[PDB]
Amino acid sequence: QDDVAPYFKTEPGLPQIHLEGNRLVLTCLAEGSWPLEFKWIRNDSELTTYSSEYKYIIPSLQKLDAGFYRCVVRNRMGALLQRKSEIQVAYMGNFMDTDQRKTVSQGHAALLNLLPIVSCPQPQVTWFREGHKIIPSSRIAITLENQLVILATTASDAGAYYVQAVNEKNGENKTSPFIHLSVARDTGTHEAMAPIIVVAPGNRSVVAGSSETTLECIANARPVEELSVHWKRNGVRLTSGLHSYGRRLTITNPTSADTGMYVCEATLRGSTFEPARARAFLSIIEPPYFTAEPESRILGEVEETMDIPCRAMGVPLPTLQWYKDAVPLSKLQNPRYKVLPSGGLHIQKLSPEDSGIFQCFASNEGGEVQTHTYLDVTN
Amino acid sequence: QDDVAPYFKTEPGLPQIHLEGNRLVLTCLAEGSWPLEFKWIRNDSELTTYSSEYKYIIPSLQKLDAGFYRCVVRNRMGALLQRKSEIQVAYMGNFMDTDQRKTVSQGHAALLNLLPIVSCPQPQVTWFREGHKIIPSSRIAITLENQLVILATTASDAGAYYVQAVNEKNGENKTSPFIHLSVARDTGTHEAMAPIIVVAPGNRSVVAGSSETTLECIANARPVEELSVHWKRNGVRLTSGLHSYGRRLTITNPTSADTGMYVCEATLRGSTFEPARARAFLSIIEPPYFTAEPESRILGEVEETMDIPCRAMGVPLPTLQWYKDAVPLSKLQNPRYKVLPSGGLHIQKLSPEDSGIFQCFASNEGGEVQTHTYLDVTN
Ligand SMILES: *[C@@H]1O[C@H](CO)[C@@H](O[C@@H]2O[C@H](CO)[C@@H](O)[C@H](O)[C@H]2NC(C)=O)[C@H](O)[C@H]1NC(C)=O
Ligand SMILES: *[C@@H]1O[C@H](CO)[C@@H](O[C@@H]2O[C@H](CO)[C@@H](O)[C@H](O)[C@H]2NC(C)=O)[C@H](O)[C@H]1NC(C)=O
Ligand SMILES: *[C@@H]1O[C@H](CO)[C@@H](O[C@@H]2O[C@H](CO)[C@@H](O)[C@H](O)[C@H]2NC(C)=O)[C@H](O)[C@H]1NC(C)=O
Ligand SMILES: *[C@@H]1O[C@H](CO)[C@@H](O[C@@H]2O[C@H](CO)[C@@H](O)[C@H](O)[C@H]2NC(C)=O)[C@H](O)[C@H]1NC(C)=O
Ligand SMILES: [Cs+]
Ligand SMILES: [Cs+]
């Protein structure tokens, strides 16, 4: 047919992590009446001009190729945006070539930050001192951000600490320089030290359907053997999902029933001390989905009114953005194309140049969906 | 601790398709008390011996590297099988270097098979004759297996046909040699020809949650302009999901409500001819999931009875296979390890050598899941 508007035969696949040096083949698998042309876009910037080549090939990936890719397909009838593809590249930088020094007063917690290093994705970190692998315990913690936390420090904890960082996707590993931790005398004259939260749990947001999410709370106290960290929800202690000496709470398969405030509570068992508390809030993201889509093809007569419906649901409420032939409506500046509050597109007096592909995108923090129609105008 | 049995920190990811020549990095991301050792397996065959290296790296993938990979992790306490990883490699072979000949009698359908070619995944095929791209129409069909079907042949259809095959994953393309189709005179003396099904729909099975599934039915008749192909279910014609001149029925998001028999029906409109019919059956596969798992760690006293529960649901009913320290129970040939019909493992008189990792796999055609426990035996 001479009247087949462009459409995609296959949608691009889920985000995959790619290795430096590997070949990458992107493809624009579209059909339609010909001349059929394709161009590529990276980060809303034009990579290629229009031609009959539907492939975009990177012979050897480097880190600067990481980004969002999409093709546009066009024939005489209109232009259609492919849904975005997320191309991540696994890479591991270097540690800065310098030692660091840190001093803490006996009895306080020492928080040793993982030395600056750029890595995708974030590495797995093993902490060392004098070739001895440091294992989490009731007194030693390693945060979700790979920081080493030594609780209730003593003179024995002084020394030179370092990391082996491993990028699990490309296999590369790096050793950091030293952090020289010194431990000075106790502040004042106090044997026991009340619980104090040194790593507070953060606000957490997770996308619906995710397997797990983990909150973390680390407290200092002395004697550390009496220290108890526990998690409360709705004023009542939680009993399941606890890990790493009670410092990690993992919620599995989180739904909206698990949203809201969580409280971690640190106590010295049997003591007269007040507990230390910190609050964290858990939020669920519902990716967008359409509740009203237009027909694939619509015929209007010149001079009549046209309505193209598009409505989407999600948490948070999705924002809708319209395109005509792969140009956003804001750029076209067409006073006859009215966007309705519910989301639909209203066209007051159809004109022959209104013919083409209208495309609606709904997006929030947790995803993006698309629907489109070919508008045909007669006479 | 000296008593941490091996466990995985991260499960391997979903099946990805890899390109020839690309680097591949597999990783065995397990923790536990050390010495901790790892070995790799490809297609139930041992690739490497046990060592402290948790990575397996293929510098440059070739087709013969395609297969199922998994690591075993072991310390003194026991051995644990990683869940399998499916490594497919995109490849495209060559057509055989020979022309073919085919003769059909005028009015009959000509079924032109795509010339033998090994390819992963199956290529996208465009059929040609004299440089002219052949487009599907009411008289020309291209099956889901890339065969060209010319209905109600005429002398004009004689000529040399060929294909451009494109592997969409690695971008490679091949042109085939020619099929020389000849069209001989009509058989007998008949103007109209009743509908006959030349490509019958097949039994289809699909995994639950799949986006789409498509059935295909192609009929011959003359005059082809009067030919109508339609789909029936429960004795009543289906109205939605039809494609390619009614020859394709796509069921979107198939559930068990769509299982059973579908009928395609070919008629010559307004004619006295009987319809031609073919039946196809659609089946849904439910991947396995557990309905009863054992605790992560279990303590038995010597000489007592132990029960390790494992029960799974799925369509078809999953089969359960047990392992101890990554050795299947059938090999161990231990008369004290009894497998119950519901799935659980029964151990009559616990002995010290029963300590270790017991691992239960449930599988059917649509997936495989695993659960495990560390059995500790005292005294
Ligand atoms: C394309 O856009 C992505 C998304 O913003 C960019 O990713 C950022 O890259 C910079 C480094 O250049 C980092 O500092 C940011 O943290 C990254 N943000 C995210 C969300 O990933 C990417 O660099 C862009 N690529 C190009 C070529 O423009
Ligand atoms: C973490 O999330 C909580 C929960 O929303 C935030 O608390 C809100 O803070 C604003 C800012 O003053 C208040 O006006 C609201 O009353 C709070 N909402 C609720 C439901 O209590 C908090 O600000 C967030 N903090 C960070 C650092 O992200
Ligand atoms: C590993 O097992 C898979 C699964 O059977 C093998 O895949 C088969 O490969 C042969 C060619 O060698 C094909 O003829 C079959 O059709 C394939 N079957 C499937 C289900 O994919 C794979 O070849 C095996 N690889 C090794 C190295 O043993
Ligand atoms: C396609 O599926 C149908 C549906 O199950 C199969 O029909 C069965 O065939 C057996 C073999 O003689 C009969 O005993 C059963 O009565 C049939 N079942 C039903 C529900 O009708 C058919 O054999 C399959 N054919 C192919 C080629 O796969
Ligand atoms: Cs649509
Ligand atoms: Cs378990």
Author numbering:
A (entry chain A), B (entry chain A): 1 to 379
What does the paper say about this structure?
Sdk1 and Sdk2 are single-pass transmembrane proteins, with extracellular regions composed of 6 N-terminal immunoglobulin (Ig) domains followed by 13 fibronectin type III (FNIII) domains, and a relatively short intracellular domain terminating in a Postsynaptic density/Discs Large/ZO-1 (PDZ) binding motif. These four domains adopt a horseshoe conformation, like many other IgSF cell-cell recognition proteins, but they interact in a unique back-to-back anti-parallel manner not previously observed. Overall, our data suggest a model in which Sdks form cis dimers on isolated cell surfaces, which dissociate to form trans dimers through the same interface when contact is made to a cell surface expressing the cognate Sdk.
The left hand panel shows a structural alignment of single protomers from the two different Sdk1Ig1–4 crystal forms and the Sdk1Ig1–5 structure, showing the very high structural similarity of individual protomers among the different crystal forms. Although the Ig1–2:Ig1–2 interaction is present in all of the crystal forms of Sdk1 and Sdk2, there is a difference in rotational angle between the two horseshoes of the dimer among the crystal forms, with the Ig1–2:Ig1–2 interface acting as the hinge. This results in differing levels of interaction between the Ig3–4 regions in the Sdk1 and Sdk2 dimers in the different crystal forms. The Ig3–4:Ig3–4 interaction varies from the Ig3–4 domains forming a considerable additional interface—as in Sdk1Ig1–4 crystal form 2 (915 Å2 BSA) and Sdk2Ig1–4 crystal form 1 (1294 Å2 BSA)—to being splayed 14 Å apart, as in the Sdk1Ig1–4 crystal form 1 structure (0 Å2 BSA).
